[PDB]
A paper describes a structure:
Flavin-binding fluorescent proteins (FbFPs), engineered from prokaryotic and eukaryotic light, oxygen, voltage (LOV) photoreceptors, are promising fluorescent reporter proteins. Their small size (about 10 kDa for monomeric FbFPs such as the improved LOV (iLOV) protein derived from Arabidopsis thaliana phototropin photoreceptors) and their oxygen-independent fluorescence make them ideal reporters to monitor transport and anaerobic biological processes. In contrast to GFP-like fluorescent reporter proteins, whose absorption and fluorescence maxima can be tuned by exchanging certain chromophore-constituting amino acids, the absorption and fluorescence of FbFPs and other flavoproteins depends on noncovalently bound flavins, whose structure cannot be influenced by mutation. Using spectroscopy, X-ray crystallography, and quantum mechanics molecular mechanics calculations, we provide a firm structural and functional understanding of spectral tuning in FbFPs.
To rule out that the [name] mutation alone is sufficient to generate the observed red-shift, we introduced the [name] mutation in parental [name] (light red solid line). The resulting variant showed nearly identical spectral properties as parental [name] (gray dashed line). The latter is corroborated by the X-ray structure of [name]-[name], which is virtually identical to parental [name] (C-α atom RMSD 0.52 Å, 102 aligned residues).
Author numbering:
A (entry chain A): 48 to 153
B (entry chain B): 48 to 152
The structure:
């Protein structure tokens, strides 16, 4: 089952919702992630260039797919097949971002 | 500001998240809508053919936009410019639906 994260569009994209699978994958409870930028999932072995591509895509409200090394709450590394897309109204205003997170470590 | 509604993909698409604007537009608090299908927003004068188009789009996980007559908690009618899109993982599985609700009254 794939994780889903919803963030606000503006002001450093704080998490506003995660599904159950997000907790299964990351080991974080909703309480522990709400109001935070998802970048806490990253650590020392996370690829800087991949993070840069995410940063620029989100700034431009551009859909992006990346395979990124993330870390469970307990510090265990896992490979995150991450898909982020802006949510737009019909006037093109960005209302939110949605992230789909799949553990592809195996 | 535009409302946003997130539902589960399966089992009659219960609401799992709404943003602030959803409450401003509909007059419903999150606690009142969570776990419910969004069809409660429809009323007597809602166009049946529009509802049928939404029903078929969701069944096939197809993106759809409709202008649909909805009703606030207090019963006042409003025109809802509604856009629904499936949220998919990289293997095409539908993880959720996202609806954007703009009051165009
Ligand atoms: C909806 C959403 C979900 C995200 N999910 C993840 C994730 O699961 N793992 C991750 O490393 N980064 C994720 N990010 C990316 C970070 O929040 C951040 O945008 C990224 O690290 C680049 O920005 P920064 O250089 O300011 O940290 C997500 C971003 C958004 C908007
Ligand atoms: C994410 C999402 C948001 C929705 N938002 C609305 C809405 O704001 N107003 C509305 O009348 N129907 C909305 N619907 C549609 C109803 O939930 C339902 O799909 C529609 O009435 C057709 O199915 P039915 O014939 O089983 O009711 C939404 C559906 C989804 C999946």
């Amino acid at each position: 089952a794939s994780g889903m994260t919803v963030t606000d569009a503006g002001a450093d994209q704080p998490i506003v919702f995660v599904n159950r699978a997000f907790s299964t994958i990351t080991g974080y409870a909703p309480n522990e992630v709400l109001g935070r930028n998802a970048r806490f999932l990253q650590g020392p072995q996370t690829d800087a260039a991949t993070v840069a591509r995410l940063r620029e895509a989100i700034a431009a409200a551009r859909p992006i797919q990346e395979r990124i090394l993330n870390y469970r709450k307990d510090g265990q590394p896992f490979w995150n097949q991450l898909s982020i897309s802006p949510v737009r109204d019909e006037t093109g205003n960005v209302v939110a971002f949605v992230g789909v997170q799949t553990d592809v470590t195996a």
